[PDB]
From a paper:
In plants, the C-terminal domain of APR itself serves the function like thioredoxin. To gain more insights into the C-terminal redox domain of plant-type APR, here we present a comprehensive structural and biochemical study of Arabidopsis thaliana APR1 (AtAPR1).
To provide insights into the structural basis of the AtAPR1 redox domain, we produced and crystallized the C-terminal redox domain of Arabidopsis APR1 (residues 353–461) and obtained crystal belonging to the tetragonal space group with the following unit-cell dimensions: a = b = 58.2, c = 86.7 Å. Finally, the crystal structure of the AtAPR1 redox domain was refined to Rwork = 17.9% and Rfree = 25.0% with high-quality backbone geometry checked by Ramachandran plot. The redox-active motif (Cys33-Pro34-Phe35-Cys36) is located at the N-terminal end of the α2-helix, consisting of residues Pro34 to Leu50. The molecular mass of the AtAPR1 redox domain in solution determined by size-exclusion chromatography was about 13 kDa, which indicates the monomeric form of the AtAPR1 redox domain. As a whole, the structural information indicates that the C-terminal redox domain of plant-type APR1 adopts a non-canonical thioredoxin fold with exceptional orientations of helices α2, α3, and α4, which is quite different from typical thioredoxins. Notably, the surface charge distribution around the GSH binding site of the AtAPR1 redox domain is ideally complementary to the charge of GSH, but other thioredoxins are not.
Numbering used by the authors: -3 to 112
Write the structure that this text describes.
């Protein structure tokens, strides 16, 4: 039973790719998570819902496990405050934008993007 199954998992190699590749034709939303965090578990279904309703939208929805060895990497470069953090990567953006990670904000995020 894997954690947050609807979201594809970036590796450290993968997300350092995401941040260095540009001409990204598509925006990304990336959840910085850690599978022992209670709020991560309670938000898990909120993120799974986000991913389903955004599937086929052109927005890639992914997750990156940011505890342990990655924790300081995520703290310096990935704007990881505390778990979970939501990073939004626009097509043409100076930097990923940290986005509030509470339930109604996620519902706000989904429904907004659906009207493009």
């Amino acid at each position: 039973p894997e954690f947050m199954e609807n979201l594809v998992t970036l590796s450290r190699q993968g997300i350092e790719n995401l941040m260095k590749l540009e001409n990204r034709k598509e925006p990304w939303i990336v959840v910085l998570y850690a599978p022992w965090c209670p709020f991560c578990q309670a938000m898990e279904a909120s993120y799974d819902e986000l991913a389903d309703k955004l599937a086929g939208s052109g927005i890639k929805v992914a997750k990156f496990r940011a505890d342990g060895d990655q924790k300081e990497f995520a703290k310096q470069e990935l704007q990881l405050g505390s778990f979970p953090t939501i990073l939004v990567f626009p097509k043409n953006s100076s930097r990923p934008i940290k986005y509030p990670s509470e339930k109604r904000d996620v519902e706000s995020l989904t429904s907004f993007l659906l009207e493009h």
